[PDB]
Each structure stands twice: as C-alpha cells, then as structure tokens.
C-alpha cells in the first residue's frame, strides 16, 4: 500500500460509518502511533498489511513494519508546532510554546492544545520539521482544558 512519508489518519469501519480513531506518522517505511489508538492491532494500507513491530503501554507508543525511527527532542526553549489532523477536517499547523510535566523521573514538554480524542497520534514538530513527539496522552487541568505530554520513544 502507501509507504510515502507523512501524516496519516487511523480509521475504522466497525462503528457507524467510517470513524477516525487517531493519527500516525510514516517515516523511513515505519508507521508510528499511540498505543491507545490501535491497542496493538494490525492495520491495512489499501491492499497491504502493516503488522506491529514494537509497543509499550506505559510509554503509550507503537511502531509498525520496523523499529521506532523518531529521535528528535524538544530543546526546552523554543515554540513548536502541533500538526493536528482532526476527524473530517484538513491537516492544520498550530504553533505553541510548550509547558512542562514534572515527574519523579524527570521533566517532559507538554502542549496545552485541546482537540477531539480522534486527533491522538498527531505529530509535534520542531523548526526543522522533525517530529519531536506525538500528541494525545495527558491530563485535564483545574479548568477543564486538556494538556498533552510531548510523547517521544525512549
């Protein structure tokens, strides 16, 4: 099927009509998404099948056809762009300055942007267009707004 680098929608026909359950990144022949989007199930790209290669529920990540290829990291200072792919809507870039998730195991960048659940897996980019992480695993704060970690493979 399609192996071209880029951002892709993850769809299902098991519910009413065609429903977008998430988003992913194709890079160097490997498809990258969040674990909660597919639960590690196989995917279809036209007539071709993508089998899971690596997954980790705690990181909430999964790769297909090969190992995780996204290695860029947020520099901790600069603004980044969420390349949001919302259900039924065109791919759209949103620029923001990340905040921080402070954990007992270190600090992680976080983006305070609110999108429908089916937007999970959208890539976060640096100024060179490199994917520094995936959007879609985070918390709801004291207001009701959503804050996502910048989740990158470790």
């Amino acid at each position: 099927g399609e192996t071209t680098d880029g951002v892709y929608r993850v769809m299902t026909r098991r519910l009413l009509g065609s429903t977008q359950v998430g988003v992913g990144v194709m890079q160097e022949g490997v498809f990258h998404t969040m674990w909660h989007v597919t639960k590690g199930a196989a995917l279809r790209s036209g007539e071709g099948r993508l089998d899971p290669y690596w997954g980790d529920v705690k990181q909430d990540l999964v790769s297909y056809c090969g190992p995780w290829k996204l290695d860029a990291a947020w520099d901790g200072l600069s603004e980044v762009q969420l390349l949001a792919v919302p259900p039924g809507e065109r791919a759209k870039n949103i620029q923001t300055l990340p905040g921080i998730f402070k954990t007992k195991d270190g600090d992680i960048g976080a983006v305070a942007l609110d999108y429908p659940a089916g937007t999970s897996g959208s890539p976060i980019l640096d100024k060179c267009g490199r994917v520094i992480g995936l959007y879609g695993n985070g918390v709801v704060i004291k207001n009701g707004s959503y804050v996502s970690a910048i989740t990158q493979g470790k």
Binding site: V57, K58, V85, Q95, T96
Partner: protein
C-alpha cells in the same frame, strides 16, 4: 478492522495560528500509561 489514509506532508509552516499557554504541572505516570495530576 483499522486502515490508514494519507493526510499530508510533515512540515513547519510559517505564519501558522499561534495559541495555547505553557503550564508547569507536577504529574505522575502509572503502569497503565495514564498521567494524573499530583
């Protein structure tokens, strides 16, 4: 059954809409991959 459809190229776009704040939050990550506010 799940399938994928191409949605675009991955590129930085000059003059994208600029929004969102930068909150510093103390968080915990459990064995199930869920974040929670401490």
């Amino acid at each position: 059954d799940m399938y994928i459809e191409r949605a675009g190229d991955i590129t930085w776009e000059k003059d994208a809409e600029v929004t969102g704040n930068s909150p510093r939050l103390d968080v915990a990550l459990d064995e199930s991959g869920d974040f929670s506010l401490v």
